[PDB]
Chain length 154, copies 3
Amino acid sequence: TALRQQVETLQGQVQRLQKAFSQYKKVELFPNGRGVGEKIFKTGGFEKTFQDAQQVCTQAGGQMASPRSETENEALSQLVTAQNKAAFLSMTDIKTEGNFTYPTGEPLVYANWAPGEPNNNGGSSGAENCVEIFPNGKWNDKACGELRLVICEF
Amino acid sequence: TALRQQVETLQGQVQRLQKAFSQYKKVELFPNGRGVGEKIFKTGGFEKTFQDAQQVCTQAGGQMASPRSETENEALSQLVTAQNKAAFLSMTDIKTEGNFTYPTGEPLVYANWAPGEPNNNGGSSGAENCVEIFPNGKWNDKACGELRLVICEF
Amino acid sequence: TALRQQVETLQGQVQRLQKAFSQYKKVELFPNGRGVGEKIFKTGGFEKTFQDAQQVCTQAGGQMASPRSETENEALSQLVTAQNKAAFLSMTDIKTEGNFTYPTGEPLVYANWAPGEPNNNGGSSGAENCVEIFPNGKWNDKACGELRLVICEF
Ligand SMILES: *[C@@H]1O[C@H](CO)[C@@H](O[C@@H]2O[C@H](CO)[C@@H](O[C@@H]3O[C@H](CO[C@H]4O[C@H](CO)[C@@H](O)[C@H](O)[C@@H]4O[C@@H]4O[C@H](CO)[C@@H](O)[C@H](O)[C@H]4NC(C)=O)[C@@H](O)[C@H](O)[C@@H]3O)[C@H](O)[C@H]2NC(C)=O)[C@H](O)[C@H]1NC(C)=O
Ligand SMILES: *[C@@H]1O[C@H](CO)[C@@H](O[C@@H]2O[C@H](CO)[C@@H](O[C@@H]3O[C@H](CO[C@H]4O[C@H](CO)[C@@H](O)[C@H](O)[C@@H]4O[C@@H]4O[C@H](CO)[C@@H](O)[C@H](O)[C@H]4NC(C)=O)[C@@H](O)[C@H](O)[C@@H]3O)[C@H](O)[C@H]2NC(C)=O)[C@H](O)[C@H]1NC(C)=O
Ligand SMILES: *[C@@H]1O[C@H](CO)[C@@H](O[C@@H]2O[C@H](CO)[C@@H](O[C@@H]3O[C@H](CO[C@H]4O[C@H](CO)[C@@H](O)[C@H](O)[C@@H]4O[C@@H]4O[C@H](CO)[C@@H](O)[C@H](O)[C@H]4NC(C)=O)[C@@H](O)[C@H](O)[C@@H]3O)[C@H](O)[C@H]2NC(C)=O)[C@H](O)[C@H]1NC(C)=O
Ligand SMILES: [Ca+2]
Ligand SMILES: [Ca+2]
Ligand SMILES: [Ca+2]
Ligand SMILES: [Ca+2]
Ligand SMILES: [Ca+2]
Ligand SMILES: [Ca+2]
């Protein structure tokens, strides 16, 4: 009976927590984050080389963005559009040229290459083994040593 | 009895959640957010026309700021003061000139017009049917096509 | 029995809350925050005098940073490194020259003074009674009237 009073009080605390949490997720993601399913993408609003971006995302507790669907890709395109800066994705063809994989090593389940890309031609930058996403959502292979918007996936 | 052990464990988890949540609300609102009652105002730190600001706030899961009291208005004034940029509020007199309403269509329950305002005179901008808030908290009717600080209400 | 169903449902809600909360802490701290133990440090990304920084942190619900260990100090150094701007710490020697204390008045349990510091010589700024932290983590006594990165502790 007293136990009953305790779980009804827990129900009220839990529901208030859920309400307040729904609100603070929306507050937190405004404006530099987007949620898709269980994933959250968030930009730090600065640019780094691919290598430094990788360290930054891991150190923060996440990883670089691996868009596995149109919906996830659109969310990233929304972030780079707002920031007006193209962002590095997680994927590279470093192990095998022309074959872009996630950092786990599996092949892409989704791809949105711009016309003509990937082309592995960064001019004076040499080969292009990383991937940038444009405001329109399209992808281009870019040299990993370039500076691009950092977006992390959590 | 075992059930008793389970709710006492729930009590501990709930309380730790409440403690950590109180802290992460303060962390999140620092420095671009303010809480007042059940409302949270947060600025994105960029400027947009009223129309674009409306889309941005809705898309993010909220709406534009509708200050219904002195306390809510002060919180907004704190945000525009920090950003040093005047912000659009939610209210317009688009439906009826001189009669400012919330987006629901109800009349203001609170108003803080600067001296002489509203005046519906944006010079070359034409009529003024939206509302900007100044660092001092005072209001001026401004053309909706101007760019002003975006603050959203959640 | 029905009570049993209610606490098992609470267990599921609590665990989902804990999972989502772990994720939104990491999202929130990226990139301007760091957690150490029960503390969270977060920079606002602007500069203020020591006096104004104190007001800002208190008003936000926290206080200025009081690094009490190497780990806490490193977290601050990570924030000023990212921002490329030295930050004020909480400690002053205002009450007694050469004796730096926390705002509670207790002496430092940890210190990381740069070589030669503290020296109480701000040139035209006069005496130096506050403390700045550099990107390398080292400390220098600086005049309290200077503008430095604002980091708050929550
Ligand atoms: C770029 O480089 C990568 C790395 O080598 C290559 O990745 C491979 O892509 C192929 C083609 O789609 C893919 O094969 C398909 O796998 C599907 C899923 O089932 C497979 O994995 C499960 C485990 O999750 C196994 O239990 C299944 O039996 C399948 O096992 C695969 O079998 C093949 C031999 O038939 C073997 O070569 C693979 O190593 C092995 N994979 C794994 C993970 O065990 C199937 O439904 C479908 O029918 C295909 O078999 C394969 O999984 C990828 N390999 C790896 C290592 O991930 C790309 O081929 C290459 N090129 C491109 C264009 O991306
Ligand atoms: C600017 O433009 C707007 C839109 O037309 C006008 O808004 C109206 O403001 C008036 C004046 O304050 C306001 O009337 C007061 O309403 C108070 C609340 O009670 C009313 O609403 C409840 C429901 O919440 C009803 O159950 C009550 O019976 C009241 O109903 C109102 O009755 C009047 C006729 O007497 C009718 O014209 C209204 O449409 C109707 N409102 C609603 C929502 O049902 C009362 O305590 C108080 O005594 C006043 O009656 C009225 O509610 C506003 N109308 C709307 C559509 O929201 C402004 O008049 C106009 N000018 C300014 C200066 O803002
Ligand atoms: C800069 O300015 C400050 C402010 O005056 C001075 O702070 C003092 O530092 C000393 C030296 O370390 C420190 O004394 C040590 O305290 C340790 C902890 O135990 C003391 O506090 C507990 C309560 O938490 C008491 O129950 C203990 O009995 C100790 O009490 C202290 O006793 C001394 C007399 O023996 C007395 O003068 C203190 O006021 C008193 N402190 C308190 C808080 O009650 C001990 O383990 C250790 O053996 C030392 O005694 C002392 O606590 C600090 N005082 C204050 C007010 O915080 C610095 O000396 C000065 N210089 C520097 C270099 O920082
Ligand atoms: Ca390549
Ligand atoms: Ca290319
Ligand atoms: Ca008007
Ligand atoms: Ca006006
Ligand atoms: Ca001094
Ligand atoms: Ca000095």
